[PDB]
Design a protein around this nucleic acid. Sequence first.
RNA 1: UUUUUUUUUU
RNA 2: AAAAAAAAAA
RNA 3: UUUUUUUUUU
RNA 4: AAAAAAAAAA
RNA 5: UUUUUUUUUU
RNA 6: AAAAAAAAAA
RNA 7: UUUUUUUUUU
RNA 8: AAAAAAAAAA
RNA 9: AAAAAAAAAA
RNA 10: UUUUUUUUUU
RNA 11: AAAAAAAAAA
RNA 12: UUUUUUUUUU
RNA 13: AAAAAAAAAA
RNA 14: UUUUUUUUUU
Lengths: 145, 144, 144, 144, 144, 144, 144
Amino acid sequence: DNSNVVTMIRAGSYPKVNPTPTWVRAIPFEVSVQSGIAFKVPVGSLFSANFRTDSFTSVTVMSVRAWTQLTPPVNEYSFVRLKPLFKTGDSTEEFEGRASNINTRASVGYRIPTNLRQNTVAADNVCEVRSNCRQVALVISCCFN
Amino acid sequence: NSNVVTMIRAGSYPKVNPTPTWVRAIPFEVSVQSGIAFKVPVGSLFSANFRTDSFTSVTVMSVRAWTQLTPPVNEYSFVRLKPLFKTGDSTEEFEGRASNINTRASVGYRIPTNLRQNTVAADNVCEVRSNCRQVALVISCCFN
Amino acid sequence: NSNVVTMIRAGSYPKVNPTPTWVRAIPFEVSVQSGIAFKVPVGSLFSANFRTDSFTSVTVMSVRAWTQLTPPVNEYSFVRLKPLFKTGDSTEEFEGRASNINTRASVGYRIPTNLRQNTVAADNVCEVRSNCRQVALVISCCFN
Amino acid sequence: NSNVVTMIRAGSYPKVNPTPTWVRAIPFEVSVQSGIAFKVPVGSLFSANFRTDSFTSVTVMSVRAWTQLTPPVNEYSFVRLKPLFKTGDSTEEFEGRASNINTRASVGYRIPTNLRQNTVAADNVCEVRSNCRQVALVISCCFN
Amino acid sequence: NSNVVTMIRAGSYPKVNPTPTWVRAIPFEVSVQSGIAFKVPVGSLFSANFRTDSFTSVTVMSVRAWTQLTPPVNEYSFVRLKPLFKTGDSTEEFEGRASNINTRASVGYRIPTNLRQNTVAADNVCEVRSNCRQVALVISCCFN
Amino acid sequence: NSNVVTMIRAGSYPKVNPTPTWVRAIPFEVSVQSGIAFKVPVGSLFSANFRTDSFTSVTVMSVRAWTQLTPPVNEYSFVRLKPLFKTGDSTEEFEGRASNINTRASVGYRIPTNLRQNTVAADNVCEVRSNCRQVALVISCCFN
Amino acid sequence: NSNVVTMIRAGSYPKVNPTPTWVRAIPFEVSVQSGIAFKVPVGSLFSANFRTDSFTSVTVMSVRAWTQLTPPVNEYSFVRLKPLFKTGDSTEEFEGRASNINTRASVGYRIPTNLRQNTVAADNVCEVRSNCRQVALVISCCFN
RNA sequence: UUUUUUUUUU
RNA sequence: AAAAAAAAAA
RNA sequence: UUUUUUUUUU
RNA sequence: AAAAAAAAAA
RNA sequence: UUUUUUUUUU
RNA sequence: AAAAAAAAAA
RNA sequence: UUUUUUUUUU
RNA sequence: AAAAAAAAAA
RNA sequence: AAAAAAAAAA
RNA sequence: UUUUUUUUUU
RNA sequence: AAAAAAAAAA
RNA sequence: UUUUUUUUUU
RNA sequence: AAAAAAAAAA
RNA sequence: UUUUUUUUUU
Ligand SMILES: [Cl-]
Ligand SMILES: [Cl-]
Ligand SMILES: [Cl-]
Ligand SMILES: [Cl-]
Ligand SMILES: [Cl-]
Ligand SMILES: [Mg+2]
Ligand SMILES: [Mg+2]
Ligand SMILES: [Mg+2]
C-alpha cells in the first residue's frame, strides 16, 4: 500500500445496493456414464453449497466443456460426446473429442450463442453426455442469477 | 455474431476451484442506543441473505455507515465509526453530521493494506455511535 | 421553403404495415403491502390509457421504480425489484433508498439482450417490495 | 456483452407521457365511381386496425394514391388528387396515369409546413378521381 | 498445382462432429384461403426434400414470401405475414402488393437476435394471408 | 441492434435450390485385419448418421487416418493408405507410425484437383493397412 | 517491495523532540442564548477528548461555525462570529443564514498572519450569536 | 526461407 | 548503477 | 530482462 | 479511465 | 492485452 | 453525440 | 447518410 | 493472415 | 495541483 | 525534490 | 527468372 | 466491399 | 447572388 | 446542379 493507517472516507448519500448479486462462474463437477447410453446432465447439479451457489434458483449457461474422468475400456482410446439440449428445442449435434494416447483424457466443449443464452432451473437438463469411460468431468461456464 | 452452437477445441483439464473468493459490498443495519457504542460483529457478514453463508472468513477493505432512522427532536443526525482490530483497536472516531434534519448523516473509513487480514464470526469490525436508533452499513470486503 | 402543395412523383406501391411495433416508456403505479412482495403483471402494459390495447405481446428492456407515497414515520423510503423470467426467476433484489425522508427512493434494472423475449398479459415482469404503499414504475419496452 | 440483469442507478422521477404522439404512414382503400369525386374522410385514419383509435386529431403531411383494381377495357389506369383544406380548398388535380394497362397509376402531393394543422374525423383530406373502382392510399401523418 | 496424390503429415486425432448445424434458405409453398390466416408449421422445414429430415429443431432468422398463383379477377396480388413466437405472438401484418396484375406480390420480415431461439415441428412460424391460393416461402434459418 | 421484427423489402423471387451441396469432414471407423488391405467403401459416407443419406455422389478431397485401437504387444502402431481411383489405382503406401506404444499412428493424403471427381456407393476410396484392428478416418469431401 | 525486515545503516544520533507541534481541526459545540453573545474560551481546545491536553498554547488560524440545533418556529437559522484578540477586539459580525429552515447556517473567518500569535486557556477566541441554542465550531489551529 | 536427384516453362 | 548467490516474474 | 533477500563493487 | 476478485478471449 | 460480472478509485 | 423502433429525404 | 416522432446511452 | 463450398449485405 | 506541521526518502 | 499522516487552499 | 512432383534445411 | 453456419491452409 | 412556385435540362 | 417564366429577398 502507501498509507499505514486508517483514513476517513467522505461518504455521501446512500448508494444503490443489492444483497443478492449475480455471479459468473466455472463450475466443476462429475457425472456417471453408461456404455452406449446418453446421460442427461441436470442443471440442478449447479446449485449446491459445494459451489457456494445454493442460494440461486436460475443460471444462464454460456459454455460446456467435458473431460473423461476414468480410464477407457481395454484397447480403446477415450472419447466423449456432447449434445446440447434446449427447452425451445433440442440439438442433434454430437461434438466429440478423442484421446490420441490411451492414458490421456478425451475432451470437447461447445459454446451457446447469445440468442440461446436464457435461464435454466434445476429440473432442466443442459446436455447429453456419451463416453466409453464410466465418469466424465464437466466444467460449465455460467451466470448465476 | 453466432446464432447456433459451435465446437470448443478444449485441451487438458484446467486448474479448477469450486469454492472461490468473492469481492462484495454488503448492506445491513444495526441497532444503536443513545450514548452507547455498538460493536459490529463480523458474523453479520456470513448469511444466506448475502449468498455468503459458505464463508467463514472475510477481509474487510472499507466501512461506510449512514443513519437509518430520523434523529431526536431539534437535532441533526450524526454517526461515528471507531475501527477495531485484533492486533489493537483504534481510538479514531470518524464522524459525519447531517446539515438538513431530514437527511442521513454518513461517514466511512478505509483499512490500509497492511491491516487487511481476515476476521471471523466472533470478531468485531468497528464501533458505531449515533443519535439515531438505527444505522445502515455498506461494508466492502473480500470473502475467502 | 414551399408555401403550397407540391406534386409527389410516386412510383410502385410500397411495402406497408398497418400494425407496426412501438418503443415506449410506460408509467403506471402499483400498490405494495408491508413485508410482502407484489408481482407486477405484464397485462398492465396493454391499455387504451397508453394507446397499447391493440398489442398482445411486449419485449421489456428495462424497469425503473420510485416510491409513490410517503414512508412510515421515522423511516426513509426504500424500494426493491426482483426480476422475473419465464425461463427462470432471478434472486437479485436491486434496492434503492432515500437519503432525505421527504424524497422518493428509486432503482431499476436492465434486461440483457439474451433475455429480451416476449411476455403476455398473464406473465409478470418483476416483484416489488417497499415500505411505501404505492410504487411508480416506468418500463421501457417494445410493443409488437 | 452482458448476459445478466444489471442495476440502473435511477435518480429523480422523470417527465412522462402515457399517451404520446406517433408519426405514421397509414394504408387504406376507398371506393371510387366513374366520373365522380370521392372525398376521403380523415375519420378513416382513426381505427383499431391501425392502432390509432385512441387519437382524435392528426396532422397530415403527404398523400400518395394508387389505383387498386384494373381499369376499364381498352384503357390505362389514372388517378387524380385534389387537396382539401379547412381554410380553403385547392383546385389542383395532381394526376398520374399508367403506361402499361396491367400496371397501377400513382400520384401524390406534399402539404407545406404552413398548412400542416390538425384535422378531425369529420374533416376530409382530399378528393379522389379515377377510372378504377378502388384506390389505395398511403397517408404520411402525425397522430397527436 | 499438383497433379498427383501427396502425403499429409497428420497429427493427433482432431475434434469431430458427425451431425453439424447447417445455415439454409428453404423454399416451400403453402395453400391459402380467401380471408383466412394460414399458420405456417415449422414441421415443413424438416424433410428429406431439403436434406433436413435428420434435424428436429431450427432457428429461423428471416422469412420472405411471394404469391405463387395469379390473383382474383380485377385485383393485384397481395401477401401479408404476421410473426408468431412461443413467448408471445405479434400483431404486425407486413404486407406487399403487386403493381402489375401479372406480377407476384412479395414481402418478408427479419427476426431480431433476441428472438432467435429454437422451434420444433409442432410450432408455427407465422401466419400468411393473401388473395392468391398459394404462397411461396423462402425461410432463412439455422438447422441444429 | 434491433430488438423487434423488422420489414424486409423483398423483390422478385430468387434462384433457389432445396438440395444444395455440402463440404464435410466425415469421421467413421473401419475394421482391419492383420496383413490384409481393407477397401474403404464410399457408401460409408452416405448415412443418416452424417445427415448425408440424401446424397448419392461425393467428391473426396483428402483422407486422414488414425489407428483406433492399441497395437499388438511389443509393437508400435502403424497405418498405411493406398489411394484408389476408378481411372486407375495408385500404388503409393503413405504410412505413419507411432513413436509411443500408447499413441495413435496417423497419416493421410491429398487428392489433386485433376483427380477430384465423383464417387458412388459401390466405389472404394482407398486401401487401409494397419497392425491395429480398427482405423478411424476423417475424409474431407464435397457431397453433391 | 520487501517482505522481510531490512537493516538500517544508522548514523549519528539525530535531533529529537518528544513534544512536537500539531496542526489540527478541532470540532466542539457551545451553548448559545437568545440575543446574548457567548465568548468561546480558548481553553476548550486543550482536552483529552482531542489528544491535546499536553498543550498549554495554540495558534488559531481560522474559525468556522454551524448551527447545531433547529431554529425557532417560522425562522431560518443564523449565526454570527465576532473575532476577539488580546491586543484589541474586533467589531465585525460575520454572519450566515440558512435558506432552508431544515438546514444549518454557517460562516467563518480567517485570522491574518500578522494576528496569528498564541492564546492560552483564559483567552477567548470569538463571540457567537445565533437563534439556535447550540452552535457547532470547527477551529483550524496549530498547537505548540 | 531454399541447395542436390527424376519431369514441364523462362 | 552493474554483477554473483537464493527466490519470484517474463 | 525487472524486482525481493544475502554479498560486492561504485 | 485504470486497478483488484470470478469468467472468457488472445 | 480487450470484454462481461462484483468491487474501487476518478 | 451515437444507436434502436415509426416516418421522410438522399 | 441527414432530419422529424418515440426510446436509450452519454 | 491470404482461400474456397452453401446463407444475412455492399 | 501547491503550500504549512510531524515522519520517511534523496 | 517525491511519498505517508494532520491541515489548508483549488 | 517465376512453377510444380518426390529428398538434405529455415 | 464482408459478418454468422457445414469442410481444407496461415 | 440565393431561395419558393410552373417549365426544361442533367 | 444550370438556365427560362412569375415572385421574393439582397
Ligand atoms: Cl419538512
Ligand atoms: Cl409497502
Ligand atoms: Cl397480359
Ligand atoms: Cl438425414
Ligand atoms: Cl457578538
Ligand atoms: Mg438529520
Ligand atoms: Mg416515498
Ligand atoms: Mg434553518
